């Protein structure tokens, strides 16, 4: 059982500064994937298994993390990217983050 | 460095029907290396289950499988007849042969995959609660239910501390189970315990 | 590509049962976990269960255990979930999950459009 | 043909101090083959720790600092000892040991691994009665009279570490006996587990004792409490 806190639940960053995300445990995690869910859209995989990147995502979408903080880095923003962001993991059942709204 | 990723971290599989376990080399080549399979069915009792080439365990040859493919570059173990016993974590270890001046001859692991097993369907059978105790402590004994759900409780029960049922699968496919309860006062008393529909008692049945 | 369909949406009545199936296609059904999330209007996502393809008694999250049934068909392809017992705030939207699981380590890959129900 | 043994399925001692390992080859002297040694962090994978061999060359691997966990090999009791030197939160795990035996076949060698050990770090122990204190369940009346089988109970509590072996056999055949058991759970202070033996008609009229394996048991051996024979 772990609980995974994201903080601040709503976060302002203007557009062209390269901003983090961040997903913290309770306890030990292995492993942390990343969703980003749009507006109106179900969830999508950005980042998976700690900082590798999902097939048809562009390529300034990183992460970073071990341990029990983890990190999710945008390079560029970009109006596109307005979305609500969640962190899940596997300890033989899943829970996912709070989740944060990014906003231009 | 060599990397061996299993498939699976955990993989449910039922009486009699096979089923496979497969560890991915994420490495220079997997015909290159021998791959050997282990098994940790006890608390951490590792158990050899077979070497690269046609040289298994003790009494593995009949029950598991071993193969090797090139082209996806993995490494295949099939359980031909999965059971209780066979219910533990399997590990995939990789030799490395040695080099030309390297002679240790270690192994490389990867994580284990949880093989949980599931007993194939029989017909609900009645469990026969029996209490036994010692002093103050009772532990009556529901034996022979197949069915997973089971509502519990004690009569008269002043204990301070409540435990919780062991379930667990005999090797005749209908799970047992024990409740223990340890009272300060009123030990001589009954066990009674609902099963599917309405009650069971361990009174006019001993 | 790997495809998850999934239905629009369903209204009910309530005290009345709702079936909700996942159709999955394009990957071998066999091998991947199944799970079902479920998501609401100012939400937190909360997990409701998972099952293996051929399995049976599949884990359930401790708040849905008793509302909550999943069954898989091979034959047919698809997963169902079956909600029973449901209550006013039992309103929200119900995705259905394919678990990566070489290198991926349980990350649900490929979501489903998911069903709004609502009562 | 010989099999690894570990006389100890556990190990706590005190953080900062010195703790030993050993494991012994049953019957058969290493002679020209090598023994390893191996360790799982917990949620992590075994890695090889260290190798000794016939010229007596310490192998290692990658990181594993140069004076930590000296590996001796004895060829008088063929025991190799493993020492582990400041244990720490990091260096709790799991440890095993393993050797190349050679098949009768020409080429083929495989690895025997042995118990392992499950290396635990804690606080200051307090060594008040952290022995298992068990308890004899006799079946109950009418019941193995009429059912023509005998169900036992081995109650236990009040033991420290982690893990505890628990395994049945009668008194006259060296065999074990299939047992089932239910898992520990937290108490106030420690833990505690019972298990349960089925016995048939032919083993009905036997004397059965319930073994348990624990490292804080008393004076470092097997406890052994005995069940009245059914009869
Ligand atoms: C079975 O249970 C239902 C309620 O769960 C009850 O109404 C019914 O009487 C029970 N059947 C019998 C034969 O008692
Ligand atoms: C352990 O603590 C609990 C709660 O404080 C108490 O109920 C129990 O009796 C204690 N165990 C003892 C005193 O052996």
């Known amino acids: 059982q772990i609980v995974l806190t994201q903080s601040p639940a709503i976060m302002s960053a203007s557009l062209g500064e390269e901003i983090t995300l961040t997903c913290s445990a309770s306890s030990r995690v292995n492993y942390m994937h990343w969703y980003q869910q749009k507006s109106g859209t179900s969830p999508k995989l950005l980042i998976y298994?700690?900082?590798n990147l999902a097939s048809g995502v562009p390529s300034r979408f990183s992460g970073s993390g071990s341990g029990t903080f983890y990190s999710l880095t945008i390079i560029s923003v970009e109006a596109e990217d307005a979305a609500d962001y969640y962190c899940?993991?596997?300890?033989?059942?899943?829970?996912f983050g709070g989740g944060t709204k990014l906003e231009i | 460095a060599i990397e061996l990723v299993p498939e699976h971290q955990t993989v449910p599989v039922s009486i009699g029907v096979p089923a496979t376990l497969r560890c991915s080399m994420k490495g220079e080549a997997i015909g290159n290396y021998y791959i050997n399979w282990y098994r940790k069915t006890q608390g951490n009792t590792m158990t050899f289950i077979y070497r690269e080439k046609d040289i298994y365990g003790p009494g593995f040859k009949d029950n598991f499988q071993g193969d090797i493919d090139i082209a996806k570059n993995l490494a295949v173990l099939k359980i031909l007849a999965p059971s209780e016993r066979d219910e533990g974590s399997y590990y995939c270890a990789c030799d490395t042969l040695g080099m030309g001046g390297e002679y240790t001859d270690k192994l490389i692991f990867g994580k284990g995959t949880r093989v949980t097993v599931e007993p194939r369907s029989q017909p609900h059978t009645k469990p026969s609660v029996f209490v036994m105790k010692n002093g103050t402590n009772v532990a009556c004994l529901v034996k022979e239910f197949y069915p997973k759900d089971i509502r519990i409780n004690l009569v008269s029960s002043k204990k301070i501390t409540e435990f919780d049922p062991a379930i667990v699968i005999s090797p005749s496919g209908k799970y047992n189970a024990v409740k223990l309860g340890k009272y300060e006062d009123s030990n001589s008393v009954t066990c009674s315990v609902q099963h599917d529909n309405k009650t069971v008692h361990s009174t006019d049945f001993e | 590509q790997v495809q998850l369909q999934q239905p629009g949406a369903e209204l009910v009545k309530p005290g009345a049962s709702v079936k909700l199936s996942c159709k999955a296609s394009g990957y071998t059904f066999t091998n991947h976990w199944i799970s079902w999330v479920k998501q609401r209007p100012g939400q937190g996502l909360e997990w409701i269960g998972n099952i293996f393809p051929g399995s049976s008694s599949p884990n359930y999250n401790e708040k849905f255990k008793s509302k909550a049934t999943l069954t898989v068909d091979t034959s047919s392809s698809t997963a169902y979930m079956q909600l029973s017992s449901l209550t006013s705030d039992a309103s929200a939207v119900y995705y259905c999950?394919?678990?990566?699981?070489?290198?991926?380590?349980?990350?649900?890959?490929?979501w489903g459009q998911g069903t709004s129900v609502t009562v | 043909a010989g099999h690894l043994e570990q006389p100890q399925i556990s190990s706590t001692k005190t953080l900062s101090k010195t703790a030993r390992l050993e494991c012994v080859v049953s019957g058969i002297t290493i002679s020209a083959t090598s023994v390893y040694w191996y360790r799982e962090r917990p949620g992590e994978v075994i890695q090889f720790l260290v190798s000794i061999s016939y010229d007596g060359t310490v192998r290692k691997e990658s990181g594993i600092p140069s004076g930590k966990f000296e590996v001796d090999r004895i060829p008088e009791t063929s025991t190799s000892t493993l020492t582990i030197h400041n244990v720490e939160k990091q260096d709790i795990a799991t440890y095993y040991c393993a050797l190349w035996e050679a098949q009768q076949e020409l080429g083929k060698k495989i690895k025997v691994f042995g118990p392992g050990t499950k290396l635990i770090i804690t606080d200051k122990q307090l060594d008040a009665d952290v022995s298992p204190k068990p308890t004899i369940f006799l079946p109950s009346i009418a019941e193995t009279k009429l059912q023509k089988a005998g169900t036992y109970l081995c109650l236990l509590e009040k033991f420290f570490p982690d893990v505890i072996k628990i395994h049945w056999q009668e008194k006259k055949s060296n065999t074990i006996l299939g047992s089932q058991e239910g898992n520990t759970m937290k108490t106030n202070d420690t833990y505690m587990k019972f298990s349960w033996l089925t016995v048939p008609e032919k083993s009905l009229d036997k004397e059965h004792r319930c073994i348990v394996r624990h490292e804080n048991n008393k004076n470092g051996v097997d406890q052994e409490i005995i069940f009245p024979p059914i009869k």
């Open positions: 899940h993991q596997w300890s033989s059942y899943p829970t």
């Open positions: 298994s700690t900082s």
């Open positions: 999950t394919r678990w990566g699981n070489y290198g991926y380590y349980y990350a649900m890959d490929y």
